């Protein structure tokens, strides 16, 4: 329902860190609305080289344990503190949408362009989440690459996870981080 | 031109370069479009991208070059196919090249700096749309052909994220089919 001009939004959009991410999450219906909106990205060849996996409820707690398991079998036993990170890897926010790339050899489309799309679809999710009243963090901790975890959540060898998008509410004021300067990144030609 | 974010996410449509028109953004307006576009998620805050803004005459110089290389390749293409090439960059007032500059970092995977480039291209479209300009995200032979890349100064450690053609549009674009959530999203857990 809530309104924000597009221009004011681009000037102010700021991610919220997963810890700062409180409850409530969104209803399955709100969430369907967010994705129905995110899958409206540029996609050369009209291929939809991505897929989403929505994690919410108790199953987050169960995954974070699969992640705690793998993590220790990885490193016998170090800091108990770090072990909490793994217990709450997926429970810091109410919902976590995993954005999987499913890019592969195509007869006309380069996996590069199919990858640029998943790049863009990840921002379109953050865009739909903020526009829908929620705050978002786009992570990919080791869980994105560690093959013992990737198997436990169903992303194959032929796929790469693009990001885990934690969605929630928050009571925390956005603070700005340093941005790139245009003398440093943009370059002009012709007038 | 004062549009709201939620409605915007529902109607957002690329209009093709071919039907993009004069006037484009002033250097002023372009600077803001990019000042706005470089605020993207970006692990390691290392800005793995750069932009090149092709305007006015150097657009013809470049299209002219495309055609030269497209004749070196195949010295007998129709006066039609030649037209297209001497037209590549003169379809829209402005053309902004987004370049990925991803190299091995010591903490940030190259994959995550590529995700950020995809992000940045949409973000530019958002900034351009938000400023009253249509925009089409192209990448044709000219994004991958090493002959041409060398004339525009895109190194070997670099790849072109896309050529974002930006201009003014008279009528809104017709929508195209989007994915069915049923096909592209699976749900895990309940509440
Ligand atoms: C990385 C990337 C490269 C693309 N290159 C082309 C191209 O060379 N020619 C073309 O007709 N469309 C190309 N497209 C598709 C267009 O941008 C098309 O306008 C877009 O898919 C429509 O998306 P929209 O309706 O959500 O705005 C590309 C899309 C992406 C993400
Ligand atoms: C593909 C990708 C993976 C990321 N993974 C992490 C992570 O595992 N941990 C972390 O503290 N930040 C991570 N980040 C950075 C953030 O998302 C951070 O919110 C971003 O740099 C903030 O940009 P913004 O203030 O314009 O929203 C990642 C960014 C991208 C594009």
UniProtKB/TrEMBL annotation, chain A:
Residues that coordinate or bind FMN: 13-15, 40, 43-44, 137-140, 177, 179
List each copy of the Nitroreductase domain by range. Answer: 13-168
Q: Which InterPro entries match?
A: NAD(P)H_nitroreductase (IPR052530), Nitroreductase (IPR029479), Nitroreductase-like (IPR000415), YdjA-like (IPR026021)
Looking at the keywords, is Coiled coil present?
no
What cofactor requirement does the entry state? FMN
Q: Which Pfam families match?
A: Nitroreductase
Q: Name one GO molecular function term.
A: oxidoreductase activity
Keywords recorded for this protein, A-Z: Flavoprotein, FMN, NAD, NADP, Nucleotide-binding, Oxidoreductase
The note on cofactor binding and number reads: Binds 1 FMN per subunit.
Q: Which domain of life is it from?
A: Bacteria
Q: Name the Enzyme Commission number(s) assigned to this protein.
A: 1.-.-.-
Q: So what family is this one in? A: Belongs to the nitroreductase family.
Name of protein: Putative NAD(P)H nitroreductase
Task: Give the organism, scientific name.
Answer: Agrobacterium fabrum (strain C58 / ATCC 33970) (Agrobacterium tumefaciens (strain C58))
């Amino acid at each position: 329902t809530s309104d924000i001009k597009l221009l004011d939004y681009l000037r102010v959009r700021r991610s919220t860190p997963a810890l700062q991410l409180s409850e409530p999450g969104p209803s399955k219906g709100e969430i369907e609305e967010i994705l129905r909106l995110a899958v409206r990205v540029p996609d050369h060849g009209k291929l939809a080289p991505w897929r989403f996996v929505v994690y919410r409820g108790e199953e987050r707690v169960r995954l974070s344990e699969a992640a705690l398991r793998i993590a220790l079998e990885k490193n016998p036993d170090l800091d108990l503190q770090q072990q909490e990170a793994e217990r709450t890897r997926f429970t810091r926010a109410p919902v976590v949408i995993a954005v999987i790339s499913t890019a592969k050899p195509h007869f006309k489309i380069p996996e590069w362009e199919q990858v640029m799309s998943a790049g863009a679809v990840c921002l379109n999710v953050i865009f739909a989440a903020n526009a829908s009243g929620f705050a978002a963090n786009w992570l990919t901790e080791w869980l994105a690459f560690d093959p013992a975890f990737l198997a436990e959540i169903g992303v194959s060898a032929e796929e790469k996870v693009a990001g885990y998008i934690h969605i929630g509410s928050t009571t925390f004021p956005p603070v700005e981080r340093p941005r790139p300067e245009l003398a440093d990144v943009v370059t002009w030609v012709g007038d």
